[model samples]
Target: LQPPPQQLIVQNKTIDLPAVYQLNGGEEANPHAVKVLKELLSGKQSKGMLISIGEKGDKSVRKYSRQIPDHKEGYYLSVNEKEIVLAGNDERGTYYALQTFAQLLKDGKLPEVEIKDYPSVRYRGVVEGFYGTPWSHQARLSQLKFYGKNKMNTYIYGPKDDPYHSAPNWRLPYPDKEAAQLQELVAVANENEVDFVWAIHPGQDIKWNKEDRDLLLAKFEKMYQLGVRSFAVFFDDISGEGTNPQKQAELLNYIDEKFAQVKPDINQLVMCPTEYNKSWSNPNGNYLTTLGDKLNPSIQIMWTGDRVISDITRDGISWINERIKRPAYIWWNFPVSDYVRDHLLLGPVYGNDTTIAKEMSGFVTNPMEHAESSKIAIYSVASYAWNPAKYDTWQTWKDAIRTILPSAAEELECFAMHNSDLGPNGHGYRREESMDIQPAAERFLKAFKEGKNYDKADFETLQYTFERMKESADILLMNTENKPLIVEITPWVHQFKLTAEMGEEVLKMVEGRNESYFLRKYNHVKALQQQMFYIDQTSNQNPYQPGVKTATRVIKPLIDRTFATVVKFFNQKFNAHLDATTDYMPHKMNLPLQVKANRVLISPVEIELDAIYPGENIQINFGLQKAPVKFVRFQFVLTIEK
Candidate 1:
């Protein structure tokens, strides 16, 4: 039902399927389509209600050849009471025709309808280019099947942590274990009609010499032998002598001439330039134009939007196209939280200009290291890429939720609604979170600030949200639909449960002017915070932006602010020694000066004091999160003379 057909019509009539029927056109039907049709018809029967299936040239489908969309991977499907026809422009389209038909068969009775469908862009899929833990072989296999079911055609394998995929080992071959995995992955991709593109990153340390070039080609040949037909060369996130534009272009052109063109079935090679985005390209230099002019026009160039991580816009696409001499193959960086690992981007895909579908050669998203959880966003990406103009963001999001886990849709929606935003990160990328609750929170805060009584309805609404957050964690825990996704997001989900508990206590403390009630709830909340901190230190312990973050944009901020302000007001009113000075750091990073280290040993050195100075001696508080060593060493060099 997603990425709804480009053209469709539903008749008033419907057909009740029989217990069994006979099939036609079995001789020329595509093998994948035939297999899926058998599954749809109960698997044991070789028959159905005249289920005719074939390509455009088949005698059974030749009459509808002209009606099929004149596009790659286009399909035409018609279901009537008398007969049903499934046709395609090619074999992949034939496979997709059955995919759509399967969706229609979900209700047990087939609706009489006709659909003509095709994708908007030539290449549509994902790139596992994030810098973190690579997806397991099982996850990769699941992703290929997922893409096939959704009609996605491209999958670029380029996890940044893979040594052989990047520098220092780009010139070498994969180990036998990894090689066998790649071979299996490639066969799976073929079964799904997906292009398993093996990409290499060598710009970090390439010599740009003949010997180096041949070794790179040798790696490609090795992968080629493993059933890989498509390939890409990456120059992203690198510095030093390898950044030269002229040399990069020369090397790419040489590969296109020597390797890509020589092979009969090899796909056109892709390249990710050193300056792959408009912001990174030097204004005075011709890095982009150099590749456009020198490299073969058949070669594809990959570009992220304006910045390293940005949304696609018409202007951005046109800017790159004018310079690159071809429609830029887009590498959209979204739901990719390598730069903000603490948060999960479980939101609908938006931000790309709908009208720019044809302006780019392809739209391939870069997903998070959490492969299973990233599928929610990837689902929308598929819907958008297949039909950009008619993409319904909110509706598709709910459909995706239901499709992922039908029984737990409401619980997942509640959890995803509160956890969409990445909070504040270095990239300045932000998303809407707790959208329905945001206005109510704003109103409540305003009333509190102006010394007016808050609305009871708003307060109740907020309580429900917090309660649901906690309940969702319980429901998600019991879900058997997507165990892999649960496994990946367990840490963050636990934090969400903790956050909701804290929110509940904060709400209770704000209800009445009872000092004893406030103190007890406050003490309990402090205990919960300690548990959260321990989880943060222990899980997802990466060097940058480690740990888990949930409900950061709305739920967490609302709780922290109301707790602080209410506690301060209570202390002022009763003249009590209630401590309002708690470590209230949310996902946005409020404390800049707190040392994030343990046992800092400032070296003993001679110091001088001047009577003229009015500065006071300070004791800095250290926040020791985690460390393997017993203590961290430190040194200070003073510039003042005594």
Candidate 2:
């Protein structure tokens, strides 16, 4: 019951079981719907209540049209004592009705009800456009099924790492194995009523001549042969001659006329331009306007809001739509951690305005390489796209978890409670982590710092989270239903357990206040930090601080600060040996600003300077963009060598 029907009215009556269904257009009225209902309805005895199912405009179903929602893929459903009716505006609509029907069966006995359902936006799904390891064939199949159940209708296959999808190999056809796999995916997608939109990234290397144009169409035909119906041409993240707007639009227009228009039952063509977002766009330039004026009106242009990674805004839609001459199809980069691969973004999808659901033609997310974990946000995105007005961040998050992994929902929720942030990356992106526990956690931290104990109630609240954190890993590790998810996120789970354990040891040190206990427990905390540090350094391939960030926003800091504070107090009291370094943050090596082994070195590098005369200078160059410096003190040893 997700994307929750637009309208539902459950009455006080229930339909009799094992009904005989009378479909208006037998074997012809949306065959997929017939197949689904065949499986749903059992024991076709004579005395059962009659179940009527049909497509709109059919003689037997026309009467139900009045209640049908006025939109593409809309449907009207009725369940009563006398008869049950399932009506649809189209084949996809009929298929969706069964999806909802299946939910009712799982949800227990159906009540007499009237229902109306449809998607808010035409294109609602995902884009495999991230630059990392692509999803496996099995993963893609699972994703398509998930989309069907959620009522999402579109999915664009544009994995940036796919050679045939981009330059050099863009002109070539897929290998035999890949072709077979894609054909199967397309068939499955069709069964689910999903538009398998295959995308090509030819803009990276394309000539604006007839030769290249024909080559592009030939590639589309090859995909068509593989059973692909919906298609897209991407011009995003490209340069050289292909970046010219006129050439890009001309190529797209010709494709729209020669290929997309000529192809049988082809969905609308979509394109991603060079200046796909406002940050990279020159406001004074005519790039967007040129495409608006030159490209066919049916061609959909994609934008990623104000930046390569940004939230959707009302003003952003207004600005881009006016220039594109149509609603900009969004390439929303969320739960996509290619730029920051070590971290897992297991948080609620937020920041997009619910009121702007209809302002865009499509809403598609670019997900992370961890396909299963990314679903937490993707599921929420489906809810937002299908029924934006009713989308609730926190509540939807809970529902998404339970719906995705009912067997281990509580354990996953506890794990996600701490793993919802990117942890200081170049994109400057962040998410709300440990949200519910933040207030109590900060209160406890403040109380301890002020030489006072926290209120008993608030301490209990913080302690409960720590307890959950400690227990979640063991339960999740033993879960069997979603073993793939458990495997993909095992590294993060390991670190989360250690961080929680550290919190427990710190609390113990505080309460016991014994000399031997302080030293022994402090040693235990140090051992835990080393283990945690080892996981950070080796668990992920990233060259950043604390590789696996568990409890980043609230819990991580809470443990580090309190651990340091405990040691400081212990030393001041006894004057015995003890160091109060959390060792949580990655050490910044004071080496020259350069790269080693192809990895760019981090900042805060040290530089040695010598005596210099007037007009002499010393310059230090950072490998990446330097962060803002509010204050700078230039230390020098000047021995007046005049």
Candidate 3:
């Protein structure tokens, strides 16, 4: 151990720890030798303690390790004076071991045992659909937490927009609020202790002009300012005008030259020129090295594809014994979000191609999107990074889920099988809306449990169904772990006096009925008390149907009352902040108009509301502005306390 080892003393308390979290080799084992040793230490030893790269270790387990998942990525735990060793062959395997380890430790103390684990690093990474979107930032943070937790750490940005078009530095990228949120993300990540890589689009936007050059520089500067010290400059998507074999070469030269004149001190410059052949053996394989030599030899290059050229060492003990090579980072192809929910276990992108590994010095995992269940993939990359010799990607995923949703482990095992069978759609990556993946998943899960003892083929079928169900769930639930559940309803205004005074009789009756209706709906969603429900309503309307009945020509007051109570209930129950924007846009119709090639306008607004009280309810009134249009389909979107 790098530091001195602490003594192992046993003590008994009211709390009881599970028997699964034991370490091997007893107190003699080095604490640093294990991956998730923190679990054995003090802190909340609850049945659901989640330890990942982002979160702080419990009070007892402070010294954390960043060792990649390899042959021996684990920790030696000492709980109740007993010692045991739990090791994983890969980072993910280590993560899984910890998950299992956590379960064992949840009862208050560590178990007495030894477990050896490893990962299988096939294609490990995530692909982002677009960079710089709300989804992008959200996905980035989520993925980081997920990867750090599971130990996979490779990612790729931009599978959505044209890399050349949506490059960095577009002012007011998202709304001010969104940008502000992103600013906080950097710090959040720092706490997580995950490695984040920066990337840029070098296409039409970088027109090889001074302004373009400065813009690119500005983009890099922004990343630098935001604590992104390292990144890759990619020249994919929109290429160029003529077929110049040296086009990429020429572009690479220009970039390096400018960078040199600007900041020669920064050494973490990672470049990727399309000049190199897809395969590493081609003469252009040295394209990056050739470019680096002319510019800054210190410049690093990022390598991807399925070539056989990753057998070099840029950094390691082999640094002195091996030939000098490019500072190379490998890109992984994994599932993008659109299809991943259908099969999170089996990746949708990046297959195993270790040619670069034998020759390269570094590796990078690129997860494209935040969704698509990319956590497992990140673990694999971390394991490989820490120690390739001990990496096994498979076990990493298993371990991750075990901790995240222990009760859900059996479901995931079912998912892994079916996902492997459904190959790529060939359209690259896009949202998969055609497949009703979720409903299908339910059937598969049922089938798996029903026929526990079946033939090999039958078992395979069960596995496939499980995969399908899980994938569907991922599509809907992936990256939405924090999706806020509607808790309360509150009105925008403080009171509903007008409704009470104008149509007291009708208002009271309608309020009572509405309250009852709400209670029913709330109970159904919460699945809490079978007959328990709470609702409050206030409306100022006489003769509910205005035109058909007699008195009321219109009932804006009554309608307002109805909305107010619904929103009020939400606010009261949620116990969270509520948004009150007067000019609230209802769910307007989504118009998918085709303005240009490959671009179809999505008129997706299914309903419209007159007012939208941020948290409690969304009102989309279906009525024409002018008179004569009767009985508009007014929908009242309410938040039910769940």
Best by TM-score: 1
Cα lDDT tens digits for candidate 1, 1-642: 776778889997888654666676667978888888877777335455677788888887887888777788999999898788899898889998988988888567889999999898889999999999999999999999989888889999999999999989988899999999999999999988899999999988899788898999999999999999999999899998788888988888888888888889986489999999988889968889998998788888999989888899989999999998999999999989999988889988888899988898888999999998888888889999999889888888888888888889999898888888988777677889899999999888889866799999999998998899889998898788899988998898899999999988988988855878888998887788777877776788787777788999988888888887788888888887665644432211112212121211133222232222222222333412222222122333222111
RMSD of 1: 5.8
Clashes of each: 2, 0, 109
* Model 2 lDDT per residue over 1-642, tens place: 677888889887765544454444455568777778877665554344666677787765777888777788888888876777778888888788878887777433677788998888888899999988899998999999889888889889999989999987999999999999999999999988889999999877788888888888999999999889888989888888988999888888888998888977898589999999888898789999999899999989998998888899999888899998889899899999888776788988999988887789999999998888988988889889988888888788888899878998988998986788777777677888887888887888888877897777876776677788878987887778887888888998988888888888888887756899888899999999888867876776543332666777888898888888878888878896687777633322333332222222333423222222232222334311333222223421211112
Query: lDDT per residue, candidate 3, 1-642, as tens digits?
Result: 101111123344433443333322223222222334553554523223232221112222234332222232333332233223333333333344455455455445454443333323322233343322224555567665665444333343444353332554431133456445545554554434333445565553445556765666666666556655444566544455421224444554565666533664433455554532244324434444445455345555545433322222334213311212544445434433233222222332223432334445445544423343444445445545443554344565565444334554544333332233222344333222213233433343344335333244533442343334434334323323333100000110111111222223322322345555544443332331111111111211112111111001112222233334444545565553433221122234323221111111222223322343223323333422223311224233333111
- Please identify model 1 stretches exceeding 4 Å from their true place: 582-642
TM-score per candidate: 0.91, 0.90, 0.46
RMSD list, candidates in order: 5.8, 6.8, 17.7
lDDT of each: 0.83, 0.80, 0.37
lDDT of 1 at 337: 94
After aligning candidate 1 to the native by TM-score, how far in Å is the CA of 219 from where it should be? Answer: 0.7
Off by over 4 Å in 2: 19-26, 42-47, 542-546, 584-642
